[PDB]
Structure formats: C-alpha cells, structure tokens
Design an enzyme around this catalytic site. Structure first.
Site, PDB file in Angstrom:
ATOM      1  N   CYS A 135      -0.699  47.969  -9.785  1.00 17.03           N
ATOM      2  CA  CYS A 135      -1.820  48.354  -8.929  1.00 17.03           C
ATOM      3  C   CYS A 135      -3.133  47.885  -9.543  1.00 17.03           C
ATOM      4  CB  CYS A 135      -1.848  49.868  -8.706  1.00 17.03           C
ATOM      5  SG  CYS A 135      -0.323  50.465  -7.931  1.00 17.03           S
ATOM      6  N   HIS A 153      -6.274  55.635  -5.647  1.00 18.55           N
ATOM      7  CA  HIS A 153      -5.201  56.582  -5.963  1.00 18.55           C
ATOM      8  C   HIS A 153      -4.966  56.741  -7.483  1.00 18.55           C
ATOM      9  CE1 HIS A 153      -2.603  52.838  -5.794  1.00 18.55           C
ATOM     10  NE2 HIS A 153      -2.186  53.392  -6.919  1.00 18.55           N
ATOM     11  N   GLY A 162       2.721  49.731 -12.283  1.00 24.08           N
ATOM     12  CA  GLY A 162       1.618  49.363 -13.142  1.00 24.08           C
ATOM     13  C   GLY A 162       0.798  48.196 -12.641  1.00 24.08           C
TER      14      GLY A 162
END
Ligand SMILES: C=Cc1cccnc1
Ligand SMILES: C=Cc1cccnc1
Lengths: 306, 306
Positions: free
Chosen positions: A145, A41, A143
């Site tokens: 991820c 993503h 942040g």
C-alpha cells in the site's frame, strides 16, 4: 528491434519513497517537498477496517502517532490532513530529491509504471494499464500500500496511481494522487468486486503495428472493413468500441507501416474470429492490449527522459 | 498477488549512465568511480566496422578523441585502455553516484534487468533472460550500445551485461562487463547468427509454481513421472534437460505449494503433449521460461533492496 513491456526508469520516484508507520500498520508514502502522501487506511487498526469514519479516526490522532522513515532517517511530522482517501503528512523536511512532478489522473486504457515498495523500500518496477473496469492487474503483496504508478515525460514525473487494496480476483484498486479512487471501490472491507472488463481495442491495434514494425506480418491481409463493421465484431468479442479518434491516434503507426488503420482492423477481426492457429505475435499467443499507441511509438523510436 | 515480468529499481544504474562520443559514433557508457566502460566498437567508423584490428585502431586515438557527457556535464578523459571488447576510459572525476557493485557473468537461464539508454539518457527498464544460445530477446534501437544489464542484491548492483549488437533475427548479443562476449559472437560485421535455442525448463517449472501460488491450478494432475521419463519428453519439445540440482532449487516452491517437483513435471509434460486447450496461465497462453526460481520467490514474497 524487439518489443518488451517496458517501464520508465524509476530513479526519480525511488528517492521519494518512504515508510509510514502508525499504530500497528506500516505502508509506503510518497515524499514530495514537505509532504508525505499515503493511503488514509494507515490510521485504521484491524477492527477499524470494516466501516470506518475516517474523519473521526483522524481527529483522535496526534502528529507524533505518525512514524515516517526516509531510509534510515526519521522524518518529523509537523502536520497532518486528509484529502479524500489519502493522508497528507506535513514533515519538517522538504525532500531534496523531489523531482519535477504533476498529479494527473489517467483514463482506462492508458499505461503507467509501478514502483512496487515494501517498508518504503523499492522492490521492483513494471508496466501496467488501467483496465476499462478501473482495476489494474498488478503484482502487489501485503505492505505494498502506498506504492505509486507514474509516467515520466522528459524530466517530469506525472504521478497517477497510489495503490490501496487487492480485490478478491487478485486485481488491484487504488486512487489518483488526489485521493480519488479509480472506479467504484472504497477503502473499507466490503464485498466489492472488479466488475466486468473489456479488451482495450486501440491498444491491440497499436501492438499489431508494433508487430509489423518488428517483422511479424503473418496476420496481415488484403481485406478491409468499415469502422462500423469492425465495431460489431468487437462487441461480440468483448472488445471495447473503436472511435474515429482512436483511428486518428493510430495514424502515425499506419503511416510508418503503410498499413491503413481499417486494414489492421480487418486483421484483428480475422484474428478474433479465427484465433492464431498456433502462431505467435511479438512472442505472445494472445492479443495484447496493455501497450498504447504512445508506448509503441516510444519503443519503436527511442525517446528518453532527463 | 499478481505476477509481472518485474525489473529491479533502476535508480542506482541511472546515475552511472553517460554518453560517449568518438568520431561519428555516439553510444552509452557506464561510469563507475573514475572509469567509463563502453563497447570498443565506438572507436570504429562505418568502414572500420567490417574486420577491424582494434589494437591498431586504439593506438591511433588520443584521450581528447573521447567526448564523455554525464548529462550536461563534460567529463575529461585522462586515460584509455582496452579490456577484451570494452573500452575503459579513465576520467578525472569519480562518479559520486557510484553504487556498490560487482562485475558478474551470468549463466544462460538467469535473468536481469536492462536499462535501455540512448545518448547516455535512460529510456526504459525491463527484465530479460540470457537465452541458452547466449542471446537475449531485448528491446534495443540504434544508439542503445552500452546499455547494461544488472541484478541488485540488497544495495549491490551486480552488472552482468553490456549491449553491443543486434543479430539478424532481432535478438541481441553483448558482453559481460569484463568485455567477454556472451556466446560465439564478435564485434565485427560477419554473417553471425543466433544459433538454435531451447526453452529453459527449470524456469517454466518455477513459473508453473508462480501460477499455483496465484490461484491457477487447472493444469495440476494426480499423475507423476520420474526425472528420466520427464527428460525424454523435454528433449522432444526442445526443452533443455532438468537436473537434480534444478529439482533441489525448486524445493522451496514445491514446499510452499505442497506440489512435489516431479508432480509439476508431470503437469508440464501434459501441457507439452496436449497444449493449453484455450486456457491461460498467469495471463499467458504460452509456457513462460524467463522467470527463475529466484524471481518467483522474489515476487511471491516481497524482498526489497536498499
Ligand atoms: C493481499 C495482499 C495485498 C496486495 C495489495 C495490497 N494490499 C494487500
Ligand atoms: C539495429 C538496431 C540496433 C539494436 C541494438 C544495437 N545496435 C543496433
């Protein structure tokens, strides 16, 4: 003695963490050999984020759309590909700090260390378990991820988790390193929710042994029970069934403490039916289920890693 | 969201850990530049261990009595010296992995990460606090002497703790990196004991804020109290006094949550006087006092380290 939620030393992973920027999105990547792994993503923008068709999104991307920073050193993307819910960004530079590793998928109930990261920069390390509902109760901000979860076995880092999202109850969902989500979650904006959880019964038992090894014995008893009778009490208290294999894995701890496993089950049953009555176990006022039998043997013995 | 006892990434410290053997004793050392730091009771043998005269013991030692292993690489001791309760073994090799560091002594109440080690080999990492009685509730087995505690601030490792011994209640005592023990403990075999402890009041407050930031609000109340009235309740419950400076340090968290500090004190007071009544806070059924205001702001914000 002592008993602490203990993570693996994180150095081998820290030198794999990088910053992947693409468009307006910045997240963490995992750099091993000449490939950076990150959540797919990253190629989405705030309005893609709803119901994206990631194969369409990726053909529209160029190699140069992917900014990869290994610290203050830029990495040149020479290729990109999609494996399930991760991107595989091929860089012109093999990570010289690449440790021996594996990509392993864990079972609900097993633990792992999490190196939380922001902008490719490690922030902290802590231990988690994979909940029976395939969530994890982590500590993750925007942040994070691309932060990974891992175990280390001698010198080999078995990567097991990539972080992808927070669910509305505050728990966390992600993938194995092959891009396959843990549990029924998707990398879209849906009304997805965790789903009902249970307590990991074998892990509470292991932690009760940790206690006995460390001197907390007030919860022991002369009583015993059958495995069947224990499992009827577990079901009442939303504990997940105990199997013969769990009893087998608990043998070493049974052996070292002289407490038969079914005797310990009797103790748990009384703890479940009576509470703790203002006492604590290993400094906890709750029954702890995020230590495996491995974890207990690991701290109560002294195994290390090179 | 989420809240976890979170340690600093340990990589910078892992590359400083070495194995110091001398006689029959093996323990961990800290290799920075051309010096290895370790506990001075390495020069003791099992019968020295009672009431040793360490200055006499050390003149009888040779450089070659000190086996230093940095992994599978031997380090040549070219000098040795004593600074309080640590040895300083001067090696012919500067540690090329030497991070930016400081030797800082912490205050009771402050936290630090502990890289537990056996035979110079890192085993796990976990977060601890310095108890008001200058002990720490660590997880340490035989061979862990010389494991260090540290904070990291950007790229700089502030070393604060060297582990030396376990006390009979299972808690742990050691030195700052200048060889000065935390608390009234000595590196001899005496009947020394921890001494009475208190709960770190400012840290419980910080953790109550952590809860409010993370959605646990059931313990809030309209009530308030004066700082004086709160401190009379703290003394009853063996909590350590709260000062105006503590209230000042709690301002940011007060500010972010909209909960005045003295309002939060009122909540703690009710929690102290009533218990939790079967509820939990940040997954705990106890009042947690091993997170500082710094730690809460650190996880609830996203500060990292290079
Ligand atoms: C909402 C904060 C968050 C936490 C984890 C991952 N992504 C976002
Ligand atoms: C008794 C075990 C132990 C723990 C810490 C340090 N030294 C020894």
């Amino acid at each position: 003695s002592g008993f602490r939620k203990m993570a693996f030393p994180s150095g081998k992973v820290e030198g794999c963490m990088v910053q992947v920027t693409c468009g307006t999105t910045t997240l963490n990547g995992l750099w091993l050999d000449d490939v950076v792994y990150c959540p797919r993503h990253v190629i989405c923008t705030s309005e893609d984020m709803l119901n994206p068709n990631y194969e369409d999104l990726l053909i529209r991307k160029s190699n140069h759309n992917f900014l990869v920073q290994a610290g203050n050193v830029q990495l040149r993307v020479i290729g990109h590909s999609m494996q399930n819910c991760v991107l595989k960004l091929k860089v012109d530079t093999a990570n010289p700090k690449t440790p021996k590793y594996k990509f392993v998928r864990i079972q609900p109930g097993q633990t792992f260390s999490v190196l939380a990261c922001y902008n490719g920069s490690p922030s902290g390390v802590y231990q988690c378990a994979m909940r029976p509902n395939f969530t994890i109760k982590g500590s993750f901000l925007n942040g994070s991820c691309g932060s990974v979860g891992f175990n280390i076995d001698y010198d080999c880092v078995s990567f097991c988790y990539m972080h992808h999202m927070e669910l509305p109850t505050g728990v966390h969902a992600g993938t194995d390193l092959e891009g396959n989500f843990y549990g029924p979650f998707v990398d879209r904006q849906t009304a997805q929710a965790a789903g009902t959880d249970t307590t990991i019964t074998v892990n509470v038992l292991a932690w009760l042994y940790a206690a006995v090894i460390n001197g907390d014995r007030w919860f022991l008893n002369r009583f015993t029970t059958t495995l069947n009778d224990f499992n009827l009490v577990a079901m009442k208290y939303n504990y997940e069934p105990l199997t013969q294999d769990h009893v087998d894995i608990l043998g070493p701890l049974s052996a070292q403490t002289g407490i038969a496993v079914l005797d310990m089950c009797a103790s748990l049953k009384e703890l479940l039916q009576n509470g703790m009555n203002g006492r604590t176990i290993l400094g906890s006022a709750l029954l702890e289920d995020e230590f495996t039998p491995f974890d207990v043997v690991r701290q109560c013995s002294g195994v290390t890693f090179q």
